Amino acid sequence: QPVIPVRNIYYMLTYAWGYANLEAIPGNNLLDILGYVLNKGVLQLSRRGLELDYNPNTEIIPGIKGRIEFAKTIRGFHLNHGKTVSTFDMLNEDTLANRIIKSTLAILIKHEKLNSTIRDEARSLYRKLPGISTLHLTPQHFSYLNGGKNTRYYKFVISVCKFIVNNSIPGQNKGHYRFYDFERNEKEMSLLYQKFLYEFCRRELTSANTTRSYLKWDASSISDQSLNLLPRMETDITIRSSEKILIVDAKYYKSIFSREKFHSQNLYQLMNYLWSLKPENGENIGGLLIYPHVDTAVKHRYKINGFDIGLCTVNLGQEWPCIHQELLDIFDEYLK
Amino acid sequence: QPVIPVRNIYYMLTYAWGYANLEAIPGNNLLDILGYVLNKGVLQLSRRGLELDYNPNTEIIPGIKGRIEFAKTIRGFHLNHGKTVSTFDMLNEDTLANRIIKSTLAILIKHEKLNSTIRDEARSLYRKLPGISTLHLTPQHFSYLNGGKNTRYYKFVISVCKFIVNNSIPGQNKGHYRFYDFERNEKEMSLLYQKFLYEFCRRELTSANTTRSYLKWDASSISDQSLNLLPRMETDITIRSSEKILIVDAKYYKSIFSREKFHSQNLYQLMNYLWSLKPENGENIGGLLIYPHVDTAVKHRYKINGFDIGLCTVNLGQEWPCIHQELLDIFDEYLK
Amino acid sequence: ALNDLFIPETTIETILKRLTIKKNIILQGPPGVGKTFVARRLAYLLTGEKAPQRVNMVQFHQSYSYEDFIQGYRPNGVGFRRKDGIFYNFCQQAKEQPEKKYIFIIDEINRANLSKVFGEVMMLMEHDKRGENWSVPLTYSENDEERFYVPENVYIIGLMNTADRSLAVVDYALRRRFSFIDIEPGFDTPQFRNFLLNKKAEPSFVESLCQKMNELNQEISKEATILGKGFRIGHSYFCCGLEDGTSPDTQWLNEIVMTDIAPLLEEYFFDDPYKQQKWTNKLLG
């Protein structure tokens, strides 16, 4: 039951969210890593300054501040006890984005399995934000912020905060928390991997164009033009260049970590993607199978039904730059 | 979260094992049904007579029975105290097959959720088999009997006994047992379904020939002739007739029970089965998708890539004969 | 015979109180805690004298029989002659000195069927039915008048191996009479440590050695139903092998780990080699 070294996982998450030295931290487990980013990440913001969004406030005060609302004043007779219903703009850091940070930190402190120094620093910051109000967090809170007015930097830590909240489980005690065993589940790990590549390829493969391509079946049915019954088919990624087009389907399987029979069931999807897809340019059509392995990388080529297909692997756990080196080498060979 | 009525499930299990009125029993849950078969099933055997297999016994007795082993007699000096080491054939019902029944019944009685009358009858039989020895059962015990010397009838109840043992979980108490929620898991339910059809079609579709067909990829790789890395591909069933060949891939999905998007991910396997398979006869090539639904049955046809493909369903929970009627109708249309 | 026993002092006293009362003790536990050694030394404790003659030790196996144990008719050159066994003869010595304590050691008693072996005598060996009053003529007794009576002086010690997965159920006949006692591995104990400290062992190697073994013992004992607590590794290998005065160090340790414990892990862990490789690395690495 072998798994990836935890430090390497953080890099793929970064590309997934689209935005460093982790040698310093000694806690190998993820939450130690993840908290150190957040705990330090907030500190980066505070140096420049946290977001202050003007919240208009309509309240009853003993005097004129901003704009008086004449109606509520007369109806409540607040003139008599020397008060007005007035609208004015207090400037707070109490926005939804910043509130999430402090509320997220509470769970971070409450986590049972955590480095003490990390918990020490976090508890300091928790105190350092008195004005902001604690909250009981839900995904809908993160949902409201998908508008993304905030800076590019804020969206990073919030993406971190989203990962923590969804991957937080109460542990030994009712109050305390315990981290999810993220690596063990394949689906989210695979869904990470599928998303990891799509954003990664845009960065490095500037030469090529990277798109996820929706496809329509070549079928026609006398029954229905809709073909709703047919499976929805959307490529994981397509990486088109003028000389050659190329589709990749990548998934995380547990069997493959064992070096025997091979689990390539996803391949069955691939041919049908090649088939229904028709290029006007007619430069070429290629496919790739790429999986994560631990020890070593092996690359093969295939010529099956008029299609050029590759099976390849990467030895995650080696080193991130050499891993980064390997991927650029990989796509270059096949793309050519 | 709707599931099949439990009584109908028993019929597909019967075809799976390749060998009735259940209106009598009032306990809808499976174990009530399953025990009634076993409890009555044993009674059917006893009327004709249970299997008696001669176990040779080499033991020390005060006289000649069968064949004396001269060596152990002299070496142990048993002549002096008027004894011999002799081989003879006691006739018992204590065989592995029959021992399994009584040991299986113990778990049956111990099950916490069970009809009282069923438990009453079983406890009677448990007493009625004194000579046979209780056992702590394992799959290896069933494994040793795959030779199948026993009659066609014995193999039926043992197949039942296998289902119980594998689908038995201890419940509230350490001793007592509680039945597995078999229906909820799709994989075994699907694996039932895949096996159900293969044996079923041999019975009814005597007109056609029914075979599971192994396939080899059309690919060639310069790297390896083996293509071990490639997925192993074995059809679920193939139902070949002189006029037309036809492949079926059937699986149980939870999404489909909801009448929306449709889960047909297995279809991706299907085309590649059609492609690598090449008929010398060149009569025709056809494919079918068939799934289980609860309410209703809907049949569609497709002409995709030069292949003739059908999507169809059956309303399990209707009635077994009308269900049996529906299947024969289904295969007939498409086969034609 | 009480200079260096790695076991805590509490249990060894508990047994002595228990032994003088019940007179039939079972020491369970993994192989490699010196069940023979502790019992052999314990025998001298109850007598208080480091005298071998009163003590005798025998190893049971499936084919061990009443004939070897007590009485049999072996042939001489011409004709058969009754031959006294161990236990029968053993008691004749004990009858001479009822004041003194005579002790019988039975290793791996669980393996054999006790009933065929003891036979008639299994009733008597219990502490209550002892003395001349409960004397019985033996199975082979030609004359009824000759009888066998278990004297009170006799104390019988039984050693049972917990380690086997093959074990399913303890014999009933054993359980009714004997008082089961479980021996912990006691890898983390002062006397074993100070013995090692007196030998050329640094505390870091001791703390390293004690630390790793405890985590291993807890792991196997933790999954109790799949594997018994008695599977957990003992300490006896580390005791012996230092007679030459060799310094115990990681150089010396790694042989014992790989040579002796490694197959034990292989038998215990027949399911996942990666799981084996995980724990073997931690012991040295």
Ligand SMILES: Nc1nc2c(ncn2[C@@H]2O[C@H](COP(=O)(O)OP(=O)(O)O)[C@@H](O)[C@H]2O)c(=O)[nH]1
């Ligand atoms: N000095 C000392 N020796 C021990 C201790 N435990 C075991 N030994 C020695 O380990 C060696 C093997 O003992 P034993 O268990 O009888 O071997 P076995 O027949 O394989 O089980 C003997 O020298 C024992 O005396 C102990 O606690 N102290």
